[PDB]
Design a protein around this nucleic acid. Structure first.
Ligand SMILES: [Mg+2]
Ligand SMILES: [Mg+2]
Ligand SMILES: [Mg+2]
Ligand SMILES: [Mg+2]
Ligand SMILES: [Mg+2]
Ligand SMILES: [Mg+2]
Ligand SMILES: [Mg+2]
Ligand SMILES: [Mg+2]
Ligand SMILES: [Mg+2]
Ligand SMILES: [Mg+2]
Ligand SMILES: [Mg+2]
Ligand SMILES: [Mg+2]
Ligand SMILES: [Mg+2]
Ligand SMILES: [Mg+2]
Ligand SMILES: [Mg+2]
Ligand SMILES: [Mg+2]
Ligand SMILES: [Mg+2]
Ligand SMILES: [Mg+2]
Ligand SMILES: [Mg+2]
Ligand SMILES: [Mg+2]
Ligand SMILES: [Mg+2]
Ligand SMILES: [Mg+2]
Ligand SMILES: [Mg+2]
Ligand SMILES: [Mg+2]
Ligand SMILES: [Mg+2]
Ligand SMILES: [Mg+2]
Ligand SMILES: [Mg+2]
Ligand SMILES: [Mg+2]
Ligand SMILES: [Mg+2]
Ligand SMILES: [Mg+2]
Ligand SMILES: [Mg+2]
Ligand SMILES: [Mg+2]
Ligand SMILES: [Mg+2]
Ligand SMILES: [Mg+2]
Ligand SMILES: [Mg+2]
Ligand SMILES: [Mg+2]
Ligand SMILES: [Mg+2]
Ligand SMILES: [Mg+2]
Ligand SMILES: [Mg+2]
Ligand SMILES: [Mg+2]
Ligand SMILES: [Mg+2]
Ligand SMILES: [Mg+2]
Ligand SMILES: [Mg+2]
Ligand SMILES: [Mg+2]
Ligand SMILES: [Mg+2]
Ligand SMILES: [Mg+2]
Ligand SMILES: [Zn+2]
Lengths: 138, 99, 124, 208, 104, 83
RNA sequence: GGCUAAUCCCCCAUGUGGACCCGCCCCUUGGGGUGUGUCCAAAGGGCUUUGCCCGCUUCCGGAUGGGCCCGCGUCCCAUCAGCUAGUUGGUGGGGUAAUGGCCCACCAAGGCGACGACGGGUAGCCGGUCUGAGAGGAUGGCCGGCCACAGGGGCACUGAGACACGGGCCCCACUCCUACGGGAGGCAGCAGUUAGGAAUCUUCCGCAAUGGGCGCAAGCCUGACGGAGCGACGCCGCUUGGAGGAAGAAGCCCUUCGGGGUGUAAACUCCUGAACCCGGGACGAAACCCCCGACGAGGGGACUGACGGUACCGGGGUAAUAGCGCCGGCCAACUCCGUGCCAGCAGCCGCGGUAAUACGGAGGGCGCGAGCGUUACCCGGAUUCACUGGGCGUAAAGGGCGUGUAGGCGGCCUGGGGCGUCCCAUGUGAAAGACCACGGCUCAACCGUGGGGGAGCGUGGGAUACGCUCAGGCUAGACG
RNA sequence: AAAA
RNA sequence: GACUUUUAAUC
């Protein structure tokens, strides 16, 4: 049994991108889906789609990378350099709208879950409502 | 030395003795009434209950009893006296009790 | 430590341990000389280091170094201990303050006089 | 007692020309002339590369040795600068410049800051009318610094304010040699000063 | 406002009195994780009405005895020993941690 | 008994009082109930006396008793001027 | 033993009203109304004397102060694990202003603990203070709030209030007086003595100001307070000079009697003028009170400063304290002589064994300057108890392995609740302090006025993604 | 043997 | 005193 899916998914993504996979599956969940929605919108990923495997609901997550590079190690720069779970079972992390973080002077995002739904720190500050600070991504 | 305010001591003592005297009577009459009550003697039981009442209120006039202390007293008295006359007494003088 | 463990035991706050039980954590302690031996250095030094077995007013009987060119302390002179060890003599963790009580200052001294306690020489 | 001792020696150690005497620090003798090497038995001897620390320590000593301020006072003006909003570097200089002793000097009433300082402690200077005998006094914008009426007749003030005729005054200041007035217009912008000091290092000396 | 607390009854063994175990929950001052702490209150039951396992509201009240400053406001949901159980077991585990070893 | 009096807040040779409402029994400079003004005996500024007549009047209406100086000052601020 | 006054004590009366018992109500713990019956009042004094002042009595209310209760928070040791008999609860009673095992009798057998009871150590708590980028750590002197104590222990009396620092009683220790029977005491009030200690001040002035007690008032009392005194103990301001201007008596200047620069520095010339002298000389103080007006509003008048002949202003006027630490590296500043693992130094690394930038002296230099340096203690650096922010193959660190209790953690879909979580409003967050602005003392320290923020907590309303809970469903975990 |  | 770079030991 997965102990913390949102983290598993986050990690699957971290792992898949480090070896430059193109696709990458992850068991599906409404919540997982909502997070993907943001990732896609912020443009950290080429999007994602629902699928089935051996007869079960998964989410193909199409990854995105920069271009090939010069010199030794011509590996593309990563679009998703950092992506870390913040709140975790066994230390849930909440924040007030006044306590929402500014991930990397703006060049990054922070996905928090609010009563108004899941939304980037920017969106959260907009509607002006905090919640459980889910993950961080830059 | 001699802080002439030893006078407060002198005065306290008189006052003490004065208070002691008043309360003693209150108790004695209180029992007194509770006594005749626990015997059906309605007329003379209320008679006394009535003195007790008076004395208490008077005691609460100055600063002997004073306060709601007096009121507890009366209450506790008009209580027992009335409840002990629950032995066929039939409040005669019905002095204090407002039956 | 997992957070739960942290919540169950927390972190032990490290306490500090004095190098100068001059008691009452005072800056100095008055004492009396019991002995005024001479001691030899350790590690890689050699000399006849001057020390004193002081009977503390704080109910202690410790040894203290006697700084300076030459001293004048006998088996009965009152003295002020000051704290500060002598790297070369293990066991000696105090110095005697030159210039206080029965400990004379250091005659012929010319420089670090405040230390060694020696009045300003007249430049007539 | 702000130093009080050989001074053209500090110019020497600082390796730069410090005008701690107004006059003479112009006539072939500030000592920094034909003897610009540090004082003492080793002044000429070959010099070893200083530590980032030494460079920072000298720079501060330079800037402070100019105004004559004590470390005590200097440090405090710096802390005040640090606290205030606005590039500490400049702001500090501005506060250093607002010192009456220095202002009396900029206006030429005295030739050196030291002389300037003495002219304040002796009641020969006035501010907005009432006399002020405090070198450290901080001049604000719009304040008028005149001369003790009863002092406008001193040989010392004569020569000086006479030599002032013809001399130009710093852009942040302005004076009237006539009634021996002078007006502090604004805090001198860093650009207005041409100090032989890189205050950025001074700031670093206090970071450590 | 008189404090109102909800909890489970873990003891009717007294006359006109019940013990209410009240669960509290909150973020740890330094470590953040939400930690759950609990406390027993001896509430007043004038008519030996409430029984074991009943979830009740408790109202801050006028002292009724040393150690007893609450009265049962009302009943939330009758029966449910599962809670009472956890409590009893935790109490039994106690006879163990000492000079020997009880049950597990 | 609650009063309106002067509390000492200046400094040596630099007295500055606060016109204050307080219990008759508290330290001169203790915990007051409300500040209703202030006063500078040496009038070192064109604002050496100020009062909140509205408030002053409140306490006077509920029994506060002013000091002699308290009154003197309150009067200046026109606390009793009915005209 | 005898006499006597009253605003001292008591009795009768009047009962606005109020208290108590029982009902012929609303409210909801003992709140409010009502009616019968009981029950309870008072003090007089002064005059400008037929009026007014001060005061008395009962009751409702205000204001201020306070008691009690509850949620949450508040150090170290588990080499302290079981604790408890008024102990937990009940009925009745006592007690109090009042709730309550507060106390008592009687019945019950309970109550508390690993979410750390009980025991031991340490300790007044807080606003705040110091430190830190912050989280945090350390701390709680001065000032402000609360608590506690008043030689040690116990107790109550009198009062609106005490279980009473300068009130009382008893026991104990100690001091003193004693015709030895018996008595007097309590500086943790100001000052001072003595002891202890490394160490902490005047047996000062004044009641003029602010505040307090009593008095109608005049006024009396006030070691509270306002001041002065001693101590660089701290903070701030200031002085020992400014501008010119390069020579060296018996000179420590590389002394078995073996002479480098300091440095425009000095000399010296000119200028100013700390001290000090003479003259003037304050704010802080206008009320209380008296007069007019009605003892009101309002107006008029007078009395009164310890500090102090001090601050400050004017006039005159002298070039007139400088010290302490350091110079091998860390760390800014180098040479000579003496010494020879000695004498000595040393924060850590280290230095001294005959050429020592490290010891002692000298010249020179660096640092700070009425200070400088030492010792002690706190925070920092130290992500070196790591929440922010650490680790465990070989550096210190995986339990010898399993089973399993408590506990922590929990897959996918839907729905209800709204406890966690988030949001809006609102109350609370005294003052001082900290921050900003402006202002007063010539500046500053210091002080005044104004301004702004704030978590936590209470109340009302709202949201429902996540955590939680209840209900239903699923089959990817688990089991069969 | 000690110190470098 | 002698040897060693000084010193212990050694003559
Ligand atoms: Mg009397
Ligand atoms: Mg050695
Ligand atoms: Mg030395
Ligand atoms: Mg007689
Ligand atoms: Mg009567
Ligand atoms: Mg009477
Ligand atoms: Mg203690
Ligand atoms: Mg830190
Ligand atoms: Mg006692
Ligand atoms: Mg004593
Ligand atoms: Mg009284
Ligand atoms: Mg009484
Ligand atoms: Mg007491
Ligand atoms: Mg006393
Ligand atoms: Mg004393
Ligand atoms: Mg002594
Ligand atoms: Mg008075
Ligand atoms: Mg007296
Ligand atoms: Mg005083
Ligand atoms: Mg000169
Ligand atoms: Mg006046
Ligand atoms: Mg008077
Ligand atoms: Mg008048
Ligand atoms: Mg060194
Ligand atoms: Mg160096
Ligand atoms: Mg040599
Ligand atoms: Mg040397
Ligand atoms: Mg100074
Ligand atoms: Mg740390
Ligand atoms: Mg350590
Ligand atoms: Mg960590
Ligand atoms: Mg480590
Ligand atoms: Mg190991
Ligand atoms: Mg193993
Ligand atoms: Mg092992
Ligand atoms: Mg389990
Ligand atoms: Mg779940
Ligand atoms: Mg909620
Ligand atoms: Mg708030
Ligand atoms: Mg505040
Ligand atoms: Mg100003
Ligand atoms: Mg809903
Ligand atoms: Mg289910
Ligand atoms: Mg050696
Ligand atoms: Mg050899
Ligand atoms: Mg030898
Ligand atoms: Zn020069």
């Amino acid at each position: 049994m997965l102990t913390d899916p949102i983290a598993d998914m986050l990690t699957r993504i971290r792992n898949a991108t480090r070896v430059y996979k193109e696709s990458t599956d992850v068991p599906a969940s409404r919540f997982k889906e909502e997070i993907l929605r943001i990732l896609a919108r912020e443009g950290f990923i080429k999007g994602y789609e629902r699928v089935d495997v051996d007869g079960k609901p998964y989410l193909r997550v199409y990854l995105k990378y920069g271009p090939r590079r010069q010199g030794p190690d011509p590996r593309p720069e990563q679009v998703i350099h950092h992506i870390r779970r913040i709140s975790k079972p066994g230390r849930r992390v909440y924040v007030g709208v006044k306590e929402i973080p500014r991930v990397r002077r703006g060049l990054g995002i922070a996905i928090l879950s609010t009563s108004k739904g899941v939304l980037t720190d920017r969106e959260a500050r907009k509607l002006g409502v905090g919640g459980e600070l889910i993950c961080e991504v830059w | 030395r001699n802080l002439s305010a030893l006078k407060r001591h002198r005065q306290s003592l008189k006052r003490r003795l004065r208070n002691k005297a008043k309360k003693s009577a209150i108790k004695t009459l209180s029992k007194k009434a509770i006594q005749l009550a626990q015997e059906g003697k309605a007329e003379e039981a209320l008679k006394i209950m009535r003195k007790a009442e008076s004395l208490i209120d008077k005691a609460a006039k100055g600063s002997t009893l004073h306060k709601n202390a007096a009121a507890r007293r009366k209450s506790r008295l008009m209580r027992k006296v009335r409840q002990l006359l629950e032995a066929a007494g039939a409040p005669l003088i019905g002095g204090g009790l407002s039956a | 430590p997992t957070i739960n463990q942290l919540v169950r035991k927390g972190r032990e706050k490290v306490r500090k341990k004095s190098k100068v039980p001059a008691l009452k954590g005072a800056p100095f302690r008055r004492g009396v000389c019991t002995v005024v031996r001479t001691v030899t250095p350790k590690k890689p030094n050699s000399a006849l280091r001057k020390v004193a077995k002081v009977r503390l007013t704080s109910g202690y009987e410790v040894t203290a170094y006697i700084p300076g060119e030459g001293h004048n302390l006998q088996e009965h002179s009152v003295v002020l201990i000051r704290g500060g060890r002598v790297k070369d003599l293990p066991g000696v963790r105090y110095h005697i303050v030159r210039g206080v009580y029965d400990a004379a200052g250091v005659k012929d001294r010319k420089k670090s006089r405040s230390k060694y306690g020696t009045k300003k020489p007249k430049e007539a | 007692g702000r130093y009080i001792g050989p001074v053209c020696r500090l110019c020497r150690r600082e390796g730069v020309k410090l005008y701690l005497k107004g006059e003479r620090c112009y006539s072939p003798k500030c000592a920094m002339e034909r003897r610009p090497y540090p004082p003492g038995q080793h002044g000429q001897k070959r010099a070893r590369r200083p530590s980032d620390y030494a460079v920072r320590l000298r720079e501060k000593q330079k800037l402070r040795r100019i105004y004559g301020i004590s470390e005590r006072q200097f440090r405090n003006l710096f802390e005040e600068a640090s606290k205030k909003k606005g590039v500490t570097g400049s702001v500090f200089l501005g506060l250093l410049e607002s010192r009456l002793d220095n202002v009396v000097y900029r206006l030429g009433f005295a030739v050196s800051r030291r002389q300037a300082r003495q002219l304040v402690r002796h009641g020969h200077i006035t501010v907005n009318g009432r006399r002020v005998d405090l070198p450290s006094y901080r001049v604000r914008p719009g304040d008028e610094i005149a001369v003790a009426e009863k002092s406008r007749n001193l040989e010392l003030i004569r020569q000086n304010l006479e030599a002032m005729k013809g001399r130009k005054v710093g852009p942040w200041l302005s004076l009237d040699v006539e009634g021996m007035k002078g007006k502090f217009l604004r805090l001198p912008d860093r650009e207005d000063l041409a100090l032989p000091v890189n205050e950025q290092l001074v700031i670093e000396f206090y970071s450590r | 406002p008189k404090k109102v607390l909800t909890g489970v009854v873990v003891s009717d063994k007294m006359q006109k009195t019940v013990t209410v175990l009240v669960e509290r929950q909150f973020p740890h001052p330094l470590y953040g994780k939400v930690i759950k702490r609990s406390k027993k209150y001896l509430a007043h039951d004038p008519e030996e009405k409430y029984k074991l396992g009943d979830v009740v509201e408790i109202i801050e009240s006028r002292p009724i005895s040393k150690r007893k400053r609450f009265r049962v406001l009302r009943l939330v949901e009758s029966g449910r020993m599962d809670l009472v159980e956890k409590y009893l077991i935790r109490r039994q585990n106690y006879q163990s941690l000492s000079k020997r070893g009880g049950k597990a | 008994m609650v009063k309106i009096r002067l509390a000492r807040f200046g400094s040596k040779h630099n007295p500055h009082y606060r016109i204050v409402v307080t219990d008759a029994r508290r330290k001169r400079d203790g915990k007051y109930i409300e500040k209703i003004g202030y006063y500078d005996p040496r009038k070192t500024t064109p604002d050496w006396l100020k009062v909140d007549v509205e408030r002053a009047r409140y306490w006077l209406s509920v029994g506060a008793q002013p000091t002699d100086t308290a009154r003197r000052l309150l009067r200046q601020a026109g606390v009793f001027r009915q005209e």
